[PDB]
XYZ file of C-alpha atoms in Angstrom:
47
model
C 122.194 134.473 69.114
C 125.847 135.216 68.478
C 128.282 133.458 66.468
C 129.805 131.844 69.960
C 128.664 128.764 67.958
C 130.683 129.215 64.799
C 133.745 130.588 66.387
C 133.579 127.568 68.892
C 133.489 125.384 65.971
C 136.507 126.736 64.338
C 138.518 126.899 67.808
C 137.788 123.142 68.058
C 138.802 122.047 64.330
C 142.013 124.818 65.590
C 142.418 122.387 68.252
C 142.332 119.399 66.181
C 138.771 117.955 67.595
C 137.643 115.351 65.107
C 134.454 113.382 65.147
C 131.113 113.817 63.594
C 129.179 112.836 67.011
C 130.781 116.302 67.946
C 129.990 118.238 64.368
C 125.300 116.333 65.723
C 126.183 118.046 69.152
C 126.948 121.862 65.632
C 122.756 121.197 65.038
C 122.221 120.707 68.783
C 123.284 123.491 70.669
C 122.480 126.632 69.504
C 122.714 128.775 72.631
C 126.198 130.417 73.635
C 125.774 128.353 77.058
C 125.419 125.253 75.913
C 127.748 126.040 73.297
C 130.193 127.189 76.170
C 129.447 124.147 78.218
C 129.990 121.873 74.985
C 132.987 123.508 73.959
C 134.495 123.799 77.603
C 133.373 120.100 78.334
C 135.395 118.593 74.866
C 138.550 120.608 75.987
C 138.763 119.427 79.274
C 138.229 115.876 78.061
C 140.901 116.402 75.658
C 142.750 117.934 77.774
């Protein structure tokens, strides 16, 4: 385990990503891939 999850967390909060839906999803992944997938999945739907 690497911090991919921490550092995706504070990339998101940098991106201004606000719901606590998305803060359950934090205590659910804790792989880097699904972290990846999460974190790639809420930018392109913000994007």
């Amino acid at each position: 385990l690497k911090n991919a999850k921490e550092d995706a967390i504070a990339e998101l909060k940098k991106a201004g990503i606000t719901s606590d839906f998305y803060x359950n999803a934090x205590n659910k992944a804790k792989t880097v891939e699904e972290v990846n997938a999460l974190k790639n999945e809420i930018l392109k739907a913000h994007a």
